[PDB]
Amino acid sequence: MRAKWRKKRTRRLKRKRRKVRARSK
Amino acid sequence: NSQVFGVARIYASFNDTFVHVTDLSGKETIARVTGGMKVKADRDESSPYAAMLAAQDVAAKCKEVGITAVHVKIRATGGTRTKTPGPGGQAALRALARSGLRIGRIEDVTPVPSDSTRKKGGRRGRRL
Amino acid sequence: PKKRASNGRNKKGRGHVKPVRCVNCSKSIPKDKAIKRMAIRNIVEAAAVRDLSEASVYPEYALPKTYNKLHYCVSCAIHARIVRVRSREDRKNRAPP
Amino acid sequence: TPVTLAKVIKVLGRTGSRGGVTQVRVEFLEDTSRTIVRNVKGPVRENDILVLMESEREARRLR
Amino acid sequence: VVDPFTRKEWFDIKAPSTFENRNVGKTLVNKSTGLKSASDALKGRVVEVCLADLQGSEDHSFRKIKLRVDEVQGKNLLTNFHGMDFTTDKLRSMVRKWQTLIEANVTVKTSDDYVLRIFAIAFTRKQANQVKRHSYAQSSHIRAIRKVISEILTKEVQGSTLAQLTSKLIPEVINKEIENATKDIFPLQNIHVRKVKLLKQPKFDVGALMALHGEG
RNA sequence: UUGACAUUGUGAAGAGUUUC
RNA sequence: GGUGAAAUUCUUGGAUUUAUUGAAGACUAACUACUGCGAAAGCAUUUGCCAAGGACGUUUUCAUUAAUCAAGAACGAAAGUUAGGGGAUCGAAGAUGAUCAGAUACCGUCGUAGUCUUAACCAUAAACUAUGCCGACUAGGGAUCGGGUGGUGUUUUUUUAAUGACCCACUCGGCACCUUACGAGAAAUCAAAGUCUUUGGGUUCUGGGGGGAGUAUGGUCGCAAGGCUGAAACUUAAAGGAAUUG
């Protein structure tokens, strides 16, 4: 698959992990 | 040179063909017809033979009202579009000269801009 | 690997040009890129010329002509057979036919 | 009906995908000033005449 | 089931005095009925015409003129100078690669109150042994050229009406004068005055209207 | 709010004897 | 109308098209090129002001002031953002019409953001010449920009001129292009990608098989988007690039 696309998948996954840990406090 | 001059506006796209006629004034138009009028297929709308008959009936009405000579002015769609005339242009035009209305004073007034607004296709275009 | 010293066409000193819209496929592509072809033709094609010469007031009057500067897109051209593929040296050469 | 005739000046060549059609030039045989191109179906050589319904079309390459 | 074509009357379009073939032609107008006027529907009209037809000259084939309906009179109607224009195949022939295309403009009023924008054009040229292949000019070149062209434009439109302006336009006085002026800098072939537009016009002035008309 | 009737006179012009 | 072809869509409200006039906001075509400018990103109608800058020229001036540079700093497409203004056009979104096994897409129709700018931000792209900067040197040719030298040159008409351009010849500084490979190369291909096992001109920075991984954490800047830095286990004997033959 595309590298730009892998990179964006990771961008979202990281934003999500951040949302999680922020809810976790 | 007593023959009265109108003007025939030939808009020749590939979607259809317009043979419009007025007097030398664009106001009080005389005759207006297409191949989109002269056949029901929806594919050959702009095609020569249909625009051929378009010019045929144009000349017919030109006579029935008494118009005898014409200055011709052709255009493609223009603006920012293909910028090329359609085959209906030549077809109706030749057929006009054949039908025998006096012909003259040819030109292409197809509008051309100074680098004007953007186009359909979004940088990457109507890819087929 | 590299296939053209051009890298396609000649910018080769500036860093930028402005683009255009291909007449068929519309594609925005740079101007120093952007395959070009002039096109001169008549409006009175070789038999309708004769018909007009008879149907014409203003004898001999003129043959105006349609002048169009087509900015082509690459593959659009390639399928139009504006051009075809060429071998290594046929590519190296820059001469018209 | 507005029929006309025209004798072949030149068999231009076989265009059309299947090798059935052939481009021809014909003199309209009433006005030798009239030499027009058309397309045909069948086997053809020179000197022969076609019976033309439309004297106006003058079609082009065929596929 | 009405056929207005057997209802509309006909009228004869006539040109100003500075033209020779002033019988411009014929046109169709609906019959002036009650509470609606053929003459007004005609007043609201304009017509484009080739200068070769205006003058009989085949040198005048490319210049073309809008002519505006000012006065309608008893199957006839007097036209005014509405503006000139310049055919397109000629332009695109003229405009070629390997040279510098130049344009100049100015807005100015006539002697009489006619506000006019004017547009002239020219192109660079090689000279008789110049083996290099483009013959471009420089910034100062183009700048002073456009400067002087605008200068002369303002001068001669000042010293004129629509009448004097057109009377100089037909013989192409202006191109020759700009050539005389701009020869000092550069060869600069292919001088033309491409376009002119009427922006503002004075009150109707039927007197001078008939004056310029009122003959033939 | 819509329409009418009057307040409401003075001239014209004109579409379908008309009264708009 | 619009297309491979269709359809949506608009049309007694007379559309499409004709024409007069006006507005809007837009972008600056043909000139537009193996040509210019600029730190790069990038930069074009017109005109005026502001200051700046290169090259050239220069029997001007000062005398080593400088070259590369971690840290630190100014710039930085497009997208994006906050608040105003502006929003013709296009147009992720979005809704529709087609096609097709489906189409959540290509394609047709409409159309929101933005697209325009403004006061602040963000600091990323093939931001590529994928070739660090400073300086030395080596091999020819002809184009060519700008500056510069000469011409009992051309042309420009006047009374020579002066000038203006143009041609020939020569020189600085730029874009670069072509032949040959002398040299280099893995091979492509390169007058620098040469001077290199005969291994050293100065200087900054970067890289060590692939995956995991610019992932994770932490720090830190950022309103956000995100950015800067930046792992590890674990898994892996192939991945990889140049050229040929098929």
From Swiss-Prot, chain B:
- Map out region (Disordered) in residue numbers: 108-128
What are the TM regions of this chain, as residue ranges? none
* Location(s) in or outside the cell: Cytoplasm; Nucleus, Nucleolus
User: Assembly and interactions?
Assistant: Component of the small ribosomal subunit (SSU). Mature yeast ribosomes consist of a small (40S) and a large (60S) subunit. The 40S small subunit contains 1 molecule of ribosomal RNA (18S rRNA) and 33 different proteins (encoded by 57 genes). The large 60S subunit contains 3 rRNA molecules (25S, 5.8S and 5S rRNA) and 46 different proteins (encoded by 81 genes). uS11 interacts with eS1 forming part of the mRNA exit tunnel. uS11 interacts with snoRNA U3. uS11 interacts with MPP10. Component of the ribosomal small subunit (SSU) processome composed of at least 40 protein subunits and snoRNA U3.
Record carries keyword Cytoplasm: yes
Range of residues in the leader sequence: none
Query: What is the predominant subcellular site recorded for this chain?
Result: cytoplasm
UniProt KW keywords: Acetylation, Cytoplasm, Nucleus, Ribonucleoprotein, Ribosomal protein, Ribosome biogenesis, rRNA processing
Which family, according to the similarity comment?
Belongs to the universal ribosomal protein uS11 family.
User: Which PANTHER family does the entry mention?
Assistant: 40S RIBOSOMAL PROTEIN S14/30S RIBOSOMAL PROTEIN S11
What processes in GO biological process is this protein linked to?
A: cytoplasmic translation; maturation of SSU-rRNA from tricistronic rRNA transcript (SSU-rRNA, 5.8S rRNA, LSU-rRNA); ribosomal small subunit assembly; translation
Instruction: Name the residue ranges with Basic residues bias.
Output: 119-128
- GO CC aspect terms: 90S preribosome; cytosol; cytosolic small ribosomal subunit; nucleolus; nucleoplasm; small-subunit processome
The molecular function terms of the Gene Ontology recorded here are: mRNA binding; structural constituent of ribosome
One Pfam family name is: Ribosomal_S11
Q: What is this protein called?
A: Small ribosomal subunit protein uS11A
UniProtKB/Swiss-Prot annotation, chain C:
Q: Does the keyword Ribonucleoprotein apply?
A: yes
GO terms of biological process kind: cytoplasmic translation; maturation of LSU-rRNA from tricistronic rRNA transcript (SSU-rRNA, 5.8S rRNA, LSU-rRNA); ribosomal subunit export from nucleus; ribosome assembly
At the top level, the lineage of the source is Eukaryota
Identify the stretch(es) annotated as Disordered: 1-19
Q: Which GO terms describe its molecular function?
A: mRNA binding; structural constituent of ribosome
- In which compartments does the protein localize? Cytoplasm
Keyword match Cell cycle: no
Which Gene Ontology cellular-component terms appear in the entry? 90S preribosome; cytosol; cytosolic small ribosomal subunit
Q: What else is known?
A: Present with 16300 molecules/cell in log phase SD medium.
**Subunit and interaction comment:** Component of the small ribosomal subunit (SSU). Mature yeast ribosomes consist of a small (40S) and a large (60S) subunit. The 40S small subunit contains 1 molecule of ribosomal RNA (18S rRNA) and 33 different proteins (encoded by 57 genes). The large 60S subunit contains 3 rRNA molecules (25S, 5.8S and 5S rRNA) and 46 different proteins (encoded by 81 genes). eS26 interacts with eS1 forming part of the mRNA exit tunnel. eS26 interacts with TSR2.
Protein name (database record): Small ribosomal subunit protein eS26A
Q: Which gene encodes it?
A: RPS26A
From Swiss-Prot, chain D:
Superkingdom:
Eukaryota
In terms of CDD domains, this protein maps to:
S1_S28E
* Compartment(s): Cytoplasm
PROSITE patterns tied to this protein: RIBOSOMAL_S28E
According to its UniProt entry, one GO biological process term is: cytoplasmic translation
Matches recorded under SUPFAM superfamilies: Nucleic acid-binding proteins (SSF50249)
One GO cellular component term of this record is: cytosol
For this protein, the record's Gene3D superfamilies field holds:
Nucleic acid-binding proteins (2.40.50.140)
PTM comment, free text: N-terminally acetylated by acetyltransferase NatB.
Is Chloroplast included in the keywords of this UniProt record?
no
> Which key words tag this protein in UniProt?
Acetylation, Cytoplasm, Ribonucleoprotein, Ribosomal protein
Q: Which InterPro entries match?
A: NA-bd_OB-fold, Ribosomal_eS28, Ribosomal_eS28_CS
Q: Which GO terms describe its molecular function?
A: structural constituent of ribosome
Residues annotated as coiled-coil are none
Principal subcellular localization: cytoplasm
What does the annotation say about its assembly with partners? Answer: Component of the small ribosomal subunit (SSU). Mature yeast ribosomes consist of a small (40S) and a large (60S) subunit. The 40S small subunit contains 1 molecule of ribosomal RNA (18S rRNA) and 33 different proteins (encoded by 57 genes). The large 60S subunit contains 3 rRNA molecules (25S, 5.8S and 5S rRNA) and 46 different proteins (encoded by 81 genes).
Q: What family does the Swiss-Prot or TrEMBL record give for this protein?
A: Belongs to the eukaryotic ribosomal protein eS28 family.
Q: What else is known?
A: Present with 8600 molecules/cell in log phase SD medium.
HAMAP family from the entry?
Ribosomal_eS28
Write down what this protein is called. Answer: Small ribosomal subunit protein eS28B
From Swiss-Prot, chain E:
Q: Name one GO cellular component term.
A: cytosol
Q: Which cysteines are joined by disulfide bonds?
A: none
**Mind telling me how this protein is modified after translation?**
N-terminally acetylated by acetyltransferase NatA.
One example of the protein's molecular function in GO is:
structural constituent of ribosome
Top-rank taxon of the source lineage equals: Eukaryota
Q: Which UniProt keywords apply?
A: Acetylation, Cytoplasm, Isopeptide bond, Phosphoprotein, Ribonucleoprotein, Ribosomal protein, Ubl conjugation
Cellular compartment(s):
Cytoplasm
One GO BP annotation here? cytoplasmic translation
- Additional comment: Present with 92400 molecules/cell in log phase SD medium.
How does the annotation summarize its subunit structure?
Component of the small ribosomal subunit (SSU). Mature yeast ribosomes consist of a small (40S) and a large (60S) subunit. The 40S small subunit contains 1 molecule of ribosomal RNA (18S rRNA) and 33 different proteins (encoded by 57 genes). The large 60S subunit contains 3 rRNA molecules (25S, 5.8S and 5S rRNA) and 46 different proteins (encoded by 81 genes). eS1 interacts directly with uS11 and eS26, which form part of the mRNA exit tunnel.
State the similarity comment.
Belongs to the eukaryotic ribosomal protein eS1 family.
Protein name (database record): Small ribosomal subunit protein eS1A
Specify first residue, last residue and whole-protein length for the fragment: 20 to 235 of 255
